[PDB]
Symmetry: D2
Subunit: 115 residues, 4 copies
């Protein structure tokens, strides 16, 4: 599992469940091309997006549909979505966890990159 996403809800103090997200890879076109997607689990996590062989160096975008999440809860949100854009880099074995902490008018994202 070279790439995992974890989403937390700062209003309810809970995993953010059933959050849709899409992963894109930058093409030589300089355009965003679909790569993988899913919905977070009851633990707010999404595993199995890609494989070591598929997840080569390049620029990736993770788009988290925060707006639909807050709309489901009946809370007016600010952002259309949360986006995390980064270069995947081979430097020994690397696993990427993208963590996101959601509030209606604020979000934070952190990368935990381990070996």
């Amino acid at each position: 599992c070279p790439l995992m996403v974890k989403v937390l809800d700062a209003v309810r103090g809970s995993p953010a469940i059933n959050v849709a997200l899409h992963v894109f890879r930058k093409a030589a076109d300089d355009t965003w091309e679909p790569f993988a997607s899913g919905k977070t689990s009851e633990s707010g996590e999404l595993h199995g997006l890609t494989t070591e062989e598929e997840f080569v160096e390049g620029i990736y975008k993770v788009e988290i549909d925060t707006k639909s999440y807050w709309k489901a809860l009946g809370i007016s949100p600010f952002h259309e979505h949360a986006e995390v854009v980064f270069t995947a880099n081979d430097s020994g074995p690397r696993r990427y966890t993208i963590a996101a902490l959601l509030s209606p008018y604020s979000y934070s994202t952190t990368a935990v990159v381990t070996n």
Copy 2:
């Protein structure tokens, strides 16, 4: 001043100075059109991006060039940029402050929205 951006450096505990940022607005054909750009001052702020008359209803994207900021300080950061995407003014004009707090492998962004 309907749109202002403030950027802070969480490593140094300081304004994030000379940070480039670009604002885009979604066009009717769903592409991102350039809207405004600038760089943060000594106070980490960018004022004067637009006017009440120009800042019409729409979907806007603020792209903050965090990578160049960290690189110039000797740091190889995680993110290519921080980008903030939001619908503006769809209930009438508002004043928007976009705040960003930067660390090499993390950032947070908050919006303060006020009624003039």
Copy 3:
């Protein structure tokens, strides 16, 4: 203004207004002595807590009463308060801005430290 506090509400996207906070300074016997207190304004800021002459070197604690803030808005939050503990002025006088960003089960705090 050597010490200022700014508090934001991440649920509403607004200043956190009328937030009570108390500042303490560690005494020579390691107890927390009252130092200053006040409440945030309509802009979410609290100015005038102290002066350059009174704000001597020491270990300071800012206790922000986040629980009463959320409760008055109908929300039962996680934290009793947010507290910020730091050594001040031990390399000479500095100006400190303590920023807090509040959500019911989360908060963040950042310091902006500048040389007068």
Copy 4:
């Protein structure tokens, strides 16, 4: 495991390893009394602080020695420590995860309370 702590390093993008923390319980004295302590693991986590029987309702303080962590890395920090103060509340089965995200001049803490 009714109470777990997880600490992340936003400068290095990694678990915050070997971070000392102390847990205190408020006494009727209105004073802070030692309850449990430990150091975060290589995954930035600290488990086994208490038990369901011991972790009764009351006010708890988690003090995270962020200053010593940053000093070990040679980075000047702002805070003496990070403190998380909360009331533990019986409302069906509840497990508490205190998560902390550390930067030298900034930290965030979030509570994930699950059933």
